[PDB]
Design a protein around this ligand. Structure first.
Ligand SMILES: *[C@@H]1O[C@H](CO)[C@@H](O[C@@H]2O[C@H](CO)[C@@H](O[C@@H]3O[C@H](CO[C@H]4O[C@H](CO)[C@@H](O)[C@H](O)[C@@H]4O)[C@@H](O)[C@H](O[C@H]4O[C@H](CO)[C@@H](O)[C@H](O)[C@@H]4O[C@H]4O[C@H](CO)[C@@H](O)[C@H](O)[C@@H]4O)[C@@H]3O)[C@H](O)[C@H]2NC(C)=O)[C@H](O)[C@H]1NC(C)=O
Ligand SMILES: *[C@@H]1O[C@H](CO)[C@@H](O[C@@H]2O[C@H](CO)[C@@H](O[C@@H]3O[C@H](CO[C@H]4O[C@H](CO)[C@@H](O)[C@H](O)[C@@H]4O)[C@@H](O)[C@H](O[C@H]4O[C@H](CO)[C@@H](O)[C@H](O)[C@@H]4O)[C@@H]3O)[C@H](O)[C@H]2NC(C)=O)[C@H](O)[C@H]1NC(C)=O
Ligand SMILES: *[C@@H]1O[C@H](CO)[C@@H](O[C@@H]2O[C@H](CO)[C@@H](O[C@@H]3O[C@H](CO)[C@@H](O)[C@H](O)[C@@H]3O)[C@H](O)[C@H]2NC(C)=O)[C@H](O)[C@H]1NC(C)=O
Ligand SMILES: *[C@@H]1O[C@H](CO)[C@@H](O[C@@H]2O[C@H](CO)[C@@H](O[C@@H]3O[C@H](CO)[C@@H](O)[C@H](O)[C@@H]3O)[C@H](O)[C@H]2NC(C)=O)[C@H](O)[C@H]1NC(C)=O
Ligand SMILES: *[C@@H]1O[C@H](CO)[C@@H](O[C@@H]2O[C@H](CO)[C@@H](O)[C@H](O)[C@H]2NC(C)=O)[C@H](O)[C@H]1NC(C)=O
Ligand SMILES: *[C@@H]1O[C@H](CO)[C@@H](O[C@@H]2O[C@H](CO)[C@@H](O)[C@H](O)[C@H]2NC(C)=O)[C@H](O)[C@H]1NC(C)=O
Ligand SMILES: *[C@@H]1O[C@H](CO)[C@@H](O[C@@H]2O[C@H](CO)[C@@H](O)[C@H](O)[C@H]2NC(C)=O)[C@H](O)[C@H]1NC(C)=O
Ligand SMILES: *[C@@H]1O[C@H](CO)[C@@H](O)[C@H](O)[C@H]1NC(C)=O
Ligand SMILES: *[C@@H]1O[C@H](CO)[C@@H](O)[C@H](O)[C@H]1NC(C)=O
Ligand SMILES: *[C@@H]1O[C@H](CO)[C@@H](O)[C@H](O)[C@H]1NC(C)=O
Ligand SMILES: *[C@@H]1O[C@H](CO)[C@@H](O)[C@H](O)[C@H]1NC(C)=O
Ligand SMILES: *[C@@H]1O[C@H](CO)[C@@H](O)[C@H](O)[C@H]1NC(C)=O
Lengths: 405, 124, 121, 397, 124, 398
């Protein structure tokens, strides 16, 4: 004599994608403050299988950053009157006529741009329109916690070493993902998550060369960058109200890099064989956002060769790579939009931890070149432990109880 | 043991901690609009589940007895097998074919015939 | 289906009540959000009345408010077997908020406090 | 002795107006929910609901929607402000030359293009009235069926009647969550791809008696209409940079249809006297012409070849006006970038918009009537599921 | 009909006579976006209170009897000291320390333990 | 033997701040209309303490006005493409203006005031003309609290905004509060019953402004008495620029104010009234809109006095404004055809103080939030906490 019974709050979930909100410790004004201590619940005897390659969280964060950043250019001054023929000489001292506060008058002004910002007849006009950044806002990175709303949850693979795919024996769940750095770094990961046990190697397809190969450090690598020239910026008046602000090697230790690389080559291990030579080589070419370790440091854009790091051959048994500022950029390959970075008073020095690599390889000993391209891979170096699930709390089951009549 | 704590335990043991997943089932300018739709979605998914509990004779939270007989064709099994040797995730997959049969059976076989019964019955 | 017994008698219409209750629940898209936001405050507004009235979980619910003859003094057969709800809601329409007000207090207030007294024994 | 009893879910509705949502067939169509692979329609036995297609809120929400969704189709597209300049032109088409802004502020550019006679005027057309924005070439202008539906707590009643003028009692009524997917087609005078009337044709007006009130006709037999832009054009995208770039250069069925139209139309006018068909009496270019967009290109014809009568195909004179200010919206003007290759258009006519004298003229003016040729069936109602009624039931304390 | 919050300055015993007045008035393009999230907050503010009312064996409005014995440490006052010489605002201040203790004791206190035994009892 | 019992709807509320929505019987349109008869519920034996200085409503009202006003210049015509002679308050300035077409130009005869002029806007900010269709007519606005909240009103005839309120009531919505942009002089505000009262965040500190509330209203007329003309010069495409108190009643009021000042400065000390010492033009002058044209009138004729223990004012116009110290945004007021006349009630003052027996009082300025405080002193937002647990010696039936 069995009967059904409704149970509410039963522990049942399914893989699913939805809208996630943000939390910001204690564009980051609308993010609710993080709980001073979050809660993490281990799921004993639970095995959940992950597929970091098919993550929706990554493609929501990426579309977020893109649409968040466009908001950072709305109340800022548009540069449209800065597409004029440039009379230039050698950094370059370019002179040009300019629109003034009133409609009638004109003004001759000289500024200082980089060889990459200009082309012989600026590079952007050929491609897209331009808007300068608001000097009031800043691009410093704050830890961002992605959280799942009610009725959903986020599972975390606890295990110290995880490929990003397959079964996770130690699983837990939290409301909010850890403080993830939204830093756009190229080639080398900056200020990221440092692996608990041994460096992990992850690629959408190991056997396929075309799929970029991500590396996660366990020992951080210090790196010093600097714009060692005391600049001064003069605010020429392209009124009314609006005003345009007219107007470098980077270093990492070698004693740690040799030590770091040797762990990397051993980390490859079986994937390419114990008995094989491992080659490091500079970038094969492509976009300037791939060829160099592009990253923003102190509000300026530093575009450095990694050619000094990447040439080595490894048999089975304080170096410095410089930089030139990139000036205007159309990050995320977005055309029709363009930001010019207004220069800053004073010398810039910033030092970040290196926490991993993005690498590409050629098909046939195998050779490795610096990776680049899409920024989605950068997020997947933090969201490998995460996936989103709905909660299905209704449960019906046979019992032996009956209600009244 | 916290939220979703008994996911890997047997159905019999997981039903002791129902109030932990149930209490955390509602969990207490652009860009900020992304967080608004989420909490709007939060209530309509919660009310969609509780509308069923409403048209079912439950309302009272977490556990509720009914008068719908458990049909053999749907997951005919030893009670000890179901609750002492099975997890809810496993069970939700086995009854999966017969769930919405039960959902529909619940609303009509039990409350629709039960309160009109009481309506006829409470006449004297 | 939905609204099936709208033309049927009140007696035949109360058989199919669970069909109207189950179906009772960047710009441009902002018009669809207010729709589904109104939907829940439209639903809970009805369920609040069912709550202060002692029903809440019930599609049909019984009470001990005597039907004052002043309200639609007609034979029971006329109301259930010779009227549609659309006709009934029009006749009661004067007394409905009286009923609504009498439902909340005339019993449940003195009926809950009664059980509170009765449960102290 | 009797007691009140609360019933929940009683079938009781009242007329009501509210916000409605959008549907997009089988999938401004970016967030519209996909339609149910099979919608559900419930007939209301023994129910008589009264309709007033002319005092319906649904049309005035649909019309206020199209105008505002359309403006969004012009916000990420290239603004044309630098194209109000003196034109040096020579000979319907015109080869106009003009100086043009380049990517740079100082430099200039001479460019020639090909405009139509309606889009230009002698200098002693848009600048006179409004500023202008070109359309995005990436969006498509193919009309797609749209379903208008009512949210939870509301419902839409449809008159399940083959012959209905939009007013009075409806004996066979059904209810649906969703209006049948509908075509928001922009047509002048003549309706295209609308709802075809079942059985005999009928005619509809807010006021027959007022000749100022337009007179909506709904065909039963559809009338195929073929039109074409037969010159292989080419367009050169001149660079008004930065980034932004301007793209520079059967009557056998009509007589059988009218013959059915006269009879139904004659019934209201009377059997004894005869009607006359004549060409448009005048107004803007939107009433005078059968103006609609075709193949992504806007298209206009004088229908004087159809409307001459007292009661192998007859072509209509057909011109193109590249710039439009539809819905009498001033301040907002759109330039239509022409398309490569020759365009062939095929659709059927489904009804007429007619005006009356103080003889019948092709109608125009307000576009609400176009929607009413579809939304006559529908009206929105609010659901009131709470009911109190007496029964012999008692609650025990 | 003393109105919304009418008995606020009255004793607890008298203020419980006018409970149904503060409970019915408990749910009662930019620029307009600022009235929307007020509506939205209004229902999650209301469902939060009633989820508790649901996790607790109540749901039923206004008043609710419990099987939690009031340990003296919470108050130590004769009910006459509480119902007839104290307002709800004063009482909420005294117990503020022990309230979340009671809230937790309620759900566990009967329903976790109370709904389960009914499941056993309703078998026979 | 006593047991816990759950009560719902218990009258318990706590101070709180939240978003408030609007109620309005063109900015006011889209604001949910008011109930034909509101309900006000008195709270017997209740004493609630208010702090008008730490009110979040004011700063939510203030942030609402600023951000709703800029939306009133968004669909309006932008005035970015913008030789004078005459003393003369206005100057007939000529200038070359672009037509519909980029190449052709147009000479113009216009009339701007001395204060608007190159125009002063370019040095600071860009400029946008107001839409001539929308109106700036003050209409009463009610601020309301959403469900789960309530607003407490101090039903006291004489209240300085702080301390305990022995007679408290609650409403869902404030009264019809006038958002009248006036300076120095409060116009069409709330009138205090019986004796006039005085309010300042800190009485000891002179720097804190001193808000005065009249009980007897002061009639005041200002008029722009010249019949002006509008020629809509074509600055296309599509866009178009539109080119061109009783002394008998005032001393009665002041004579009540010295009695209103009372013991705050001492009975013996003399009370002197002097004009403002200076600052921004929005402070120095009784600035307000009247009939769409912005009035700036010198009040030195009202504030010249020395009161022992025992009336026309000049006026000038500015065509453009940057209200609320907002830079980057500037509005040109398109003038109105015809003569302008207004009749308003002076309902209160804003006053400052100086650093023996000499007390100097100046007309007020600075933050416009103070004038909202002349309406929101009776109000504060509270959060409703309806859940209660208590013992009643009933046990659940089992
Ligand atoms: C509204 O606006 C009014 C002004 O119109 C303002 O009133 C002022 O308040 C402040 C404090 O809030 C007062 O300043 C304090 O005054 C006392 C006493 O001052 C008298 O006595 C001394 C000694 O004889 C004289 O020098 C002086 O001239 C006065 O006659 C001072 O003692 C205070 O200073 C002490 O505390 C400081 C803490 O930071 C120390 O840094 C300092 O060294 C002093 O420490 C010594 O004294 C302490 C006891 O006070 C003792 O504990 C220490 O160990 C040490 O020995 C302080 O300056 C000011 O006088 C008020 N003025 C008037 C005109 O009223 C209100 O505050 C304002 N309202 C609001 C709400 O802000
Ligand atoms: C749909 O469209 C039709 C028109 O096509 C409109 O119909 C007209 O409606 C108006 C009123 O709404 C009618 O005007 C009224 O007619 C009355 C009767 O007129 C006849 O009889 C008199 C006397 O023998 C003759 O002079 C006349 O020629 C007709 O033969 C008049 O008595 C009315 O005037 C009285 O009332 C007014 C009130 O203001 C007084 O000032 C007058 O002094 C007088 O006391 C009035 O003139 C008109 O006749 C209708 N015409 C037709 C053709 O039907 C509908 O109104 C419209 N629908 C809607 C909804 O508007
Ligand atoms: C990776 O993390 C490092 C931290 O080790 C980041 O360096 C830090 O960068 C911030 C701003 O980007 C610096 O803060 C600024 O400091 C200056 C001078 O003190 C001050 O004027 C500013 O107001 C601001 O406070 C911080 O000093 C600096 N710290 C170090 C140790 O360098 C680095 O920016 C991160 N890298 C990336 C790519 O985000
Ligand atoms: C009236 O309705 C008819 C549909 O019966 C419309 O004709 C349809 O027009 C669309 C585009 O206007 C055609 O789609 C196109 O097809 C071509 C060829 O496959 C393709 O290259 C395009 O990308 C596009 O998909 C569609 O085939 C055509 N259907 C038929 C049956 O001819 C007509 O446009 C409507 N008239 C008006 C004025 O809206
Ligand atoms: C639940 O399943 C167990 C098996 O796991 C059943 O136990 C068997 O019972 C029969 C007699 O009832 C014995 O002959 C078998 O030897 C038992 N096997 C084991 C492994 O215990 C048990 O009967 C089932 N429970 C019920 C209520 O039917
Ligand atoms: C402001 O103007 C009004 C007129 O609009 C004056 O009010 C008049 O006052 C006189 C006597 O002072 C009366 O005889 C009139 O009947 C009033 N007319 C109206 C329409 O109110 C008012 O006096 C003026 N204010 C001052 C200070 O002079
Ligand atoms: C204060 O209120 C008075 C009314 O007492 C307003 O005077 C009206 O002003 C409008 C235009 O601003 C006129 O159309 C009315 O005819 C006036 N009525 C009277 C009786 O004078 C006055 O405008 C308000 N003041 C402010 C600053 O808004
Ligand atoms: C480089 O940065 C490190 C910190 O990472 C700092 O200790 C060191 O002093 C810097 N290099 C030099 C040459 O100072
Ligand atoms: C048992 O369930 C099946 C569906 O799986 C149903 O067809 C059958 O009718 C049920 N048994 C009885 C006796 O009705
Ligand atoms: C109209 O076009 C159709 C094809 O769509 C063609 O078969 C038919 O012959 C044409 N008729 C006329 C009259 O042009
Ligand atoms: C109207 O045209 C369509 C093609 O767009 C055709 O399929 C349909 O049959 C025509 N109408 C009728 C009634 O045949
Ligand atoms: C309640 O009383 C129990 C004894 O029955 C005691 O253990 C507990 O400490 C008391 N509550 C608090 C909050 O101390």
């Amino acid at each position: 004599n069995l009967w059904v019974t409704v149970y509410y709050g039963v522990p049942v979930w399914k893989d699913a994608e939805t809208t996630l909100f943000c939390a910001s410790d204690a564009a980051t004004h609308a993010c609710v403050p993080t709980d001073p201590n979050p809660q993490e619940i281990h799921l004993e005897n639970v095995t959940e299988e992950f597929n970091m390659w098919k993550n929706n969280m990554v493609e929501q964060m990426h579309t977020d950053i893109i649409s968040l950043w466009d908001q950072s250019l709305k109340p800022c001054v548009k540069l449209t009157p800065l597409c004029v023929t440039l009379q230039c000489t050698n950094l370059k001292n370019c002179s040009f006529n300019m629109t003034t506060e009133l409609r009638d008058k004109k003004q001759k002004v000289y500024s200082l741009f980089y060889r990459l910002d200009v082309v012989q007849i600026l590079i952007n006009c050929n491609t897209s329109a331009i808007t300068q950044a608001c000097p009031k806002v800043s691009f410093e990175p704050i830890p961002i916690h992605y959280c799942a709303p009610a009725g959903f949850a986020i599972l975390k693979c606890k295990d110290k070493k995880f490929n990003g795919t397959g079964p996770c024996p130690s699983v837990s769940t939290v409301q909010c993902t850890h403080g993830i750095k939204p830093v756009v770094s190229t080639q080398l990961l900056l200020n990221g998550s440092l692996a608990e046990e041994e460096v992990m190697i992850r690629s959408e397809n190991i056997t396929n060369n075309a799929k970029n190969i991500l590396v996660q450090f366990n020992t951080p690598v210090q790196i010093n960058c600097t714009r060692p020239n005391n600049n001064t910026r003069k605010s020429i008046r392209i009124g009314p109200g609006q005003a345009f602000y007219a107007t470098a090697h980077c270093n990492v230790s070698k004693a740690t890099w040799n030590e770091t690389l040797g762990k990397v080559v051993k980390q490859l291990r079986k994937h390419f064989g114990n008995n094989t030579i491992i080659r490091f080589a500079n970038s094969s070419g492509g976009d300037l956002e791939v060829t160099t370790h592009s990253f923003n440091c102190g509000g300026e854009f530093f575009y450095c060769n990694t050619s000094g790091l990447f040439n080595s051959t490894w048999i089975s048994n304080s170096i410095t790579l410089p930089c030139r500022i990139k000036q205007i950029i159309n990050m995320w390959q977005r055309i029709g939009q363009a930001m010019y970075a207004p220069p800053i008073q004073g010398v810039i020095r910033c030092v970040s931890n290196i926490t991993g690599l993005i690498l590409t390889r050629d098909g046939g000993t195998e050779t490795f070149r610096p990776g680049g391209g899409d920024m989605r891979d950068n997020w997947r170096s933090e969201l490998y432990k995460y996936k989103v699930v709905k909660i299905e709390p209704l449960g019906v089951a046979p019992t032996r109880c009956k209600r009244r009549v | 043991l916290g939220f979703l704590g008994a996911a890997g335990s047997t159905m019999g043991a997981a039903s002791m901690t129902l109030t932990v997943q149930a209490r955390n089932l509602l969990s207490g300018t652009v860009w900020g609009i992304k967080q608004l739709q989420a909490r709007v979605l939060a209530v309509e998914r919660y009310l969609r589940d509780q509308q069923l509990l409403g048209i079912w004779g439950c309302s009272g939270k977490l556990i509720c007895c009914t008068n719908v007989p458990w049909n053999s064709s749907w997951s005919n099994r030893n009670l000890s097998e179901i609750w002492d040797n099975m997890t809810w995730l496993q069970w939700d997959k086995e009854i999966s074919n017969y769930t919405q049969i039960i959902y529909g059976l619940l609303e009509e076989s039990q409350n629709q015939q039960e309160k009109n019964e009481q309506d006829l019955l409470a006449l004297d």
